Enzyme design. Sequence first.
Site, PDB file in Angstrom:
ATOM      1  N   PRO A  23       0.838  -1.214   0.000  1.00 45.91           N
ATOM      2  CA  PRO A  23       0.000   0.000   0.000  1.00 45.91           C
ATOM      3  C   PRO A  23       0.865   1.253   0.000  1.00 45.91           C
ATOM      4  O   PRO A  23       1.787   1.377   0.801  1.00 45.91           O
ATOM      5  CB  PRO A  23      -0.803  -0.124   1.307  1.00 45.91           C
ATOM      6  CG  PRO A  23       0.051  -1.002   2.225  1.00 45.91           C
ATOM      7  CD  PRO A  23       0.735  -1.978   1.265  1.00 45.91           C
ATOM      8  N   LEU A  24       0.552   2.197  -0.889  1.00 41.55           N
ATOM      9  CA  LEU A  24       1.407   3.370  -1.091  1.00 41.55           C
ATOM     10  C   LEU A  24       0.555   4.611  -1.324  1.00 41.55           C
ATOM     11  O   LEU A  24       0.005   4.792  -2.418  1.00 41.55           O
ATOM     12  CB  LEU A  24       2.344   3.163  -2.272  1.00 41.55           C
ATOM     13  CG  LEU A  24       3.290   1.967  -2.206  1.00 41.55           C
ATOM     14  CD1 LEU A  24       3.627   1.464  -3.607  1.00 41.55           C
ATOM     15  CD2 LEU A  24       4.552   2.415  -1.467  1.00 41.55           C
ATOM     16  N   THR A  25       0.497   5.477  -0.320  1.00 44.55           N
ATOM     17  CA  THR A  25      -0.094   6.800  -0.464  1.00 44.55           C
ATOM     18  C   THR A  25       0.647   7.616  -1.524  1.00 44.55           C
ATOM     19  O   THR A  25       1.867   7.809  -1.450  1.00 44.55           O
ATOM     20  CB  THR A  25      -0.052   7.511   0.889  1.00 44.55           C
ATOM     21  OG1 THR A  25      -0.935   6.841   1.799  1.00 44.55           O
ATOM     22  CG2 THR A  25      -0.453   8.959   0.760  1.00 44.55           C
ATOM     23  N   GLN A  98      -7.101  -0.845   1.063  1.00 48.00           N
ATOM     24  CA  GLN A  98      -6.616  -0.640   2.427  1.00 48.00           C
ATOM     25  C   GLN A  98      -7.459   0.434   3.118  1.00 48.00           C
ATOM     26  O   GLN A  98      -7.472   1.591   2.680  1.00 48.00           O
ATOM     27  CB  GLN A  98      -5.142  -0.236   2.450  1.00 48.00           C
ATOM     28  CG  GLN A  98      -4.594  -0.278   3.895  1.00 48.00           C
ATOM     29  CD  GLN A  98      -3.199   0.282   4.047  1.00 48.00           C
ATOM     30  OE1 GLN A  98      -2.944   1.433   3.712  1.00 48.00           O
ATOM     31  NE2 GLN A  98      -2.305  -0.511   4.618  1.00 48.00           N
ATOM     32  N   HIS A 174      -5.781  -1.194   7.945  1.00 51.41           N
ATOM     33  CA  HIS A 174      -4.519  -0.547   8.297  1.00 51.41           C
ATOM     34  C   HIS A 174      -4.459  -0.398   9.815  1.00 51.41           C
ATOM     35  O   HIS A 174      -5.153   0.446  10.389  1.00 51.41           O
ATOM     36  CB  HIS A 174      -4.415   0.810   7.598  1.00 51.41           C
ATOM     37  CG  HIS A 174      -3.036   1.399   7.599  1.00 51.41           C
ATOM     38  ND1 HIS A 174      -2.075   1.059   8.526  1.00 51.41           N
ATOM     39  CD2 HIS A 174      -2.460   2.310   6.780  1.00 51.41           C
ATOM     40  CE1 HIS A 174      -0.962   1.726   8.268  1.00 51.41           C
ATOM     41  NE2 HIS A 174      -1.171   2.494   7.214  1.00 51.41           N
ATOM     42  N   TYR A 179      -1.302   5.221  13.085  1.00 53.66           N
ATOM     43  CA  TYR A 179      -2.630   5.773  12.855  1.00 53.66           C
ATOM     44  C   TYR A 179      -3.580   5.268  13.944  1.00 53.66           C
ATOM     45  O   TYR A 179      -3.139   4.763  14.979  1.00 53.66           O
ATOM     46  CB  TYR A 179      -3.062   5.485  11.418  1.00 53.66           C
ATOM     47  CG  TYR A 179      -2.074   6.102  10.437  1.00 53.66           C
ATOM     48  CD1 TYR A 179      -1.926   7.484  10.352  1.00 53.66           C
ATOM     49  CD2 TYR A 179      -1.279   5.307   9.611  1.00 53.66           C
ATOM     50  CE1 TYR A 179      -1.022   8.064   9.482  1.00 53.66           C
ATOM     51  CE2 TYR A 179      -0.378   5.882   8.741  1.00 53.66           C
ATOM     52  CZ  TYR A 179      -0.248   7.250   8.676  1.00 53.66           C
ATOM     53  OH  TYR A 179       0.653   7.824   7.811  1.00 53.66           O
ATOM     54  N   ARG A 266      13.030  -2.625  10.109  1.00 53.34           N
ATOM     55  CA  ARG A 266      13.982  -1.693   9.478  1.00 53.34           C
ATOM     56  C   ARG A 266      13.290  -0.563   8.622  1.00 53.34           C
ATOM     57  O   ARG A 266      14.001   0.130   7.876  1.00 53.34           O
ATOM     58  CB  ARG A 266      14.992  -2.462   8.618  1.00 53.34           C
ATOM     59  CG  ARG A 266      14.434  -3.016   7.313  1.00 53.34           C
ATOM     60  CD  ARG A 266      14.993  -4.397   7.042  1.00 53.34           C
ATOM     61  NE  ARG A 266      14.282  -5.056   5.953  1.00 53.34           N
ATOM     62  CZ  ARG A 266      14.807  -5.981   5.157  1.00 53.34           C
ATOM     63  NH1 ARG A 266      16.065  -6.380   5.324  1.00 53.34           N
ATOM     64  NH2 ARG A 266      14.060  -6.520   4.207  1.00 53.34           N
ATOM     65  N   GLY A 318       7.212  -2.001  -2.034  1.00 61.97           N
ATOM     66  CA  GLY A 318       6.608  -0.693  -2.197  1.00 61.97           C
ATOM     67  C   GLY A 318       7.355   0.180  -3.191  1.00 61.97           C
ATOM     68  O   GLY A 318       6.943   0.300  -4.349  1.00 61.97           O
ATOM     69  N   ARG A 319       8.477   0.768  -2.761  1.00 65.80           N
ATOM     70  CA  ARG A 319       9.193   1.716  -3.607  1.00 65.80           C
ATOM     71  C   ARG A 319       9.639   1.094  -4.930  1.00 65.80           C
ATOM     72  O   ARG A 319       9.572   1.752  -5.977  1.00 65.80           O
ATOM     73  CB  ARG A 319      10.373   2.306  -2.834  1.00 65.80           C
ATOM     74  CG  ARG A 319       9.885   3.227  -1.718  1.00 65.80           C
ATOM     75  CD  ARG A 319      10.956   3.561  -0.702  1.00 65.80           C
ATOM     76  NE  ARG A 319      11.327   2.378   0.051  1.00 65.80           N
ATOM     77  CZ  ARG A 319      12.418   2.291   0.803  1.00 65.80           C
ATOM     78  NH1 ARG A 319      13.234   3.339   0.896  1.00 65.80           N
ATOM     79  NH2 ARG A 319      12.680   1.164   1.462  1.00 65.80           N
TER      80      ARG A 319
HETATM   81  C1  LIG Z   1       5.479   6.896  -0.661  1.00 65.25           C
HETATM   82  C2  LIG Z   1       5.049   5.857   0.314  1.00 65.25           C
HETATM   83  C3  LIG Z   1       3.705   5.740   0.612  1.00 65.25           C
HETATM   84  C4  LIG Z   1       3.281   4.763   1.505  1.00 65.25           C
HETATM   85  N1  LIG Z   1       1.944   4.659   1.812  1.00 65.25           N
HETATM   86  C5  LIG Z   1       1.497   3.663   2.646  1.00 65.25           C
HETATM   87  C6  LIG Z   1       0.132   3.500   2.904  1.00 65.25           C
HETATM   88  O1  LIG Z   1      -0.740   4.210   2.357  1.00 65.25           O
HETATM   89  N2  LIG Z   1      -0.262   2.508   3.765  1.00 65.25           N
HETATM   90  C7  LIG Z   1       0.673   1.681   4.365  1.00 65.25           C
HETATM   91  O2  LIG Z   1       0.315   0.791   5.110  1.00 65.25           O
HETATM   92  N3  LIG Z   1       2.005   1.833   4.103  1.00 65.25           N
HETATM   93  C8  LIG Z   1       2.420   2.810   3.244  1.00 65.25           C
HETATM   94  N4  LIG Z   1       3.766   2.934   2.986  1.00 65.25           N
HETATM   95  C9  LIG Z   1       4.731   1.948   3.572  1.00 65.25           C
HETATM   96  C10 LIG Z   1       4.893   0.860   2.460  1.00 65.25           C
HETATM   97  O3  LIG Z   1       3.716   0.077   2.231  1.00 65.25           O
HETATM   98  C11 LIG Z   1       6.068  -0.093   2.688  1.00 65.25           C
HETATM   99  O4  LIG Z   1       5.841  -0.795   3.885  1.00 65.25           O
HETATM  100  C12 LIG Z   1       7.396   0.672   2.741  1.00 65.25           C
HETATM  101  O5  LIG Z   1       7.561   1.462   1.570  1.00 65.25           O
HETATM  102  C13 LIG Z   1       8.608  -0.252   2.886  1.00 65.25           C
HETATM  103  O6  LIG Z   1       8.674  -1.175   1.811  1.00 65.25           O
HETATM  104  P1  LIG Z   1       9.662  -1.002   0.554  1.00 65.25           P
HETATM  105  O7  LIG Z   1      11.110  -1.063   1.019  1.00 65.25           O
HETATM  106  O8  LIG Z   1       9.361  -2.174  -0.332  1.00 65.25           O
HETATM  107  O9  LIG Z   1       9.404   0.355  -0.072  1.00 65.25           O
HETATM  108  C14 LIG Z   1       4.196   3.904   2.094  1.00 65.25           C
HETATM  109  C15 LIG Z   1       5.548   4.032   1.795  1.00 65.25           C
HETATM  110  C16 LIG Z   1       5.971   5.005   0.907  1.00 65.25           C
HETATM  111  C17 LIG Z   1       7.438   5.152   0.603  1.00 65.25           C
HETATM  112  O1  LIG Z   2       1.144   9.605   3.555  1.00 67.52           O
HETATM  113  C1  LIG Z   2       2.006   8.823   3.775  1.00 67.52           C
HETATM  114  C2  LIG Z   2       1.751   7.502   4.500  1.00 67.52           C
HETATM  115  C3  LIG Z   2       2.817   6.825   5.079  1.00 67.52           C
HETATM  116  C4  LIG Z   2       2.612   5.629   5.740  1.00 67.52           C
HETATM  117  C5  LIG Z   2       1.331   5.100   5.818  1.00 67.52           C
HETATM  118  O2  LIG Z   2       1.141   3.904   6.474  1.00 67.52           O
HETATM  119  C6  LIG Z   2       0.258   5.767   5.250  1.00 67.52           C
HETATM  120  C7  LIG Z   2       0.472   6.970   4.587  1.00 67.52           C
END
Ligand SMILES: Cc1cc2nc3c(=O)[nH]c(=O)nc-3n(C[C@H](O)[C@H](O)[C@H](O)COP(=O)(O)O)c2cc1C
Ligand SMILES: O=Cc1ccc(O)cc1
Length: 379
Positions: A23-25, A98, A174, A179, A266, A318-319
């Site tokens: 999930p990515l905002t 989510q 979530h 939150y 981490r 995510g990223r």
């Molecule tokens: C830009 C961005 C937005 C994110 N938005 C959410 C979100 O809406 N809900 C959530 O549970 N996690 C969110 N995360 C956390 C990610 O789901 C994920 O756990 C985190 O990026 C680490 O994983 P990665 O190394 O694969 O990026 C967000 C992370 C980033 C960088």
């Molecule tokens: O807006 C950013 C964001 C970061 C982590 C989350 O879990 C949800 C939203």
Amino acid sequence: MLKLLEPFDLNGLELANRMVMAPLTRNRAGPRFVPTKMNALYYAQRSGLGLIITEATQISQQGMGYPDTPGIYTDEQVDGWRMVTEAVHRREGCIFLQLWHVGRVSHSSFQPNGQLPVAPSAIAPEGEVMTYDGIKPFETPRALETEEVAHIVEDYRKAAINAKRAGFDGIEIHSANGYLLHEFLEDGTNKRTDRYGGSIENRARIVFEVLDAVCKVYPSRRVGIRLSPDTEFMSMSDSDRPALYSYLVQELSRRELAYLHLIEPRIKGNVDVEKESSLNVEFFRPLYKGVLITAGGYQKETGEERLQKQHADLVAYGRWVIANPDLPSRFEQNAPLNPYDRATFYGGNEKGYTDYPFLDPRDSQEALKEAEAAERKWR
Ligand SMILES: Cc1cc2nc3c(=O)[nH]c(=O)nc-3n(C[C@H](O)[C@H](O)[C@H](O)COP(=O)(O)O)c2cc1C
Ligand SMILES: O=Cc1ccc(O)cc1
Ligand SMILES: O=Cc1ccc(O)cc1
Ligand SMILES: O=Cc1ccc(O)cc1
């Protein structure tokens, strides 16, 4: 060769592989928090991931805390999401919404009638928050009355009803990253003396009540939950996290949910951080008997190792998925990975959103074709 690319049976949802879009905002909702055709293209592009989990989506305006995040509490928002779920699905993908309530991580400028954000206890998070009118200091939130928690639970139920009409295969609660639900779980933020505070059982109560409610809408095997067992993100703290999350994961195991989604320590919400913690997925794998998604900081090599050594069932990225819509194909070909651009994570337009390239241009053309058809279908 890669277990990451092995198809996976999620209790009747046959996922194309064991990779999950985390999930990515992205803060790219349209007016009145309604998803757009550009959002539909974004998710259609990423339909090659075995499972998509959407950006966090607020269940109410009270539950919002960042600009231009999408909602699931109005009929117009539902119809916008139908565009997204149709474009996914036409690309033979699978997608869970989510469900979000930001709790104290918000600002009165986002809230109905300029009200304070709500929380288990009147404790402001540290630092500053982005508002329509510039960066502002966080406010002390209003502590919820005992009788108000049931209304928020009902907002989750109504959100699930709307997610179902929008066509989502499932929903993810979530309960991570500081939150509302996470604030109830942890005794650094939950100072309540009613049945939602005190004991570990009482602090988890709101989570079980949310699960009870949405499992009257979706069957339990289509409801997941996300936890961050050991993060400092957004001023979180708890006096005994091993005890808290062992209890919670053991209870969640008995509920036979779709999955449990755990964030590795981490990761501090949206950034990497160096940290010594034992509360990673290996700690929890023996405590949870269902489908286990591990997320946070993974690469191809380390995600594959988690699957090979049976520490998790699915790996969320995510990223890397922001930058690589065809990440599974890139892994399988041992292709380079497009770099992710943090400067375009939040807000803005197509740039850094739908303009990351595919290995195969036909893949990009197909995503556009299906997004455009969905827009015509659900205009
Ligand atoms: C830009 C961005 C937005 C994110 N938005 C959410 C979100 O809406 N809900 C959530 O549970 N996690 C969110 N995360 C956390 C990610 O789901 C994920 O756990 C985190 O990026 C680490 O994983 P990665 O190394 O694969 O990026 C967000 C992370 C980033 C960088
Ligand atoms: O807006 C950013 C964001 C970061 C982590 C989350 O879990 C949800 C939203
Ligand atoms: O309430 C207004 C509205 C607009 C468009 C929709 O699709 C649904 C509702
Ligand atoms: O919606 C615009 C936006 C920009 C930057 C953010 O951090 C959040 C939202």
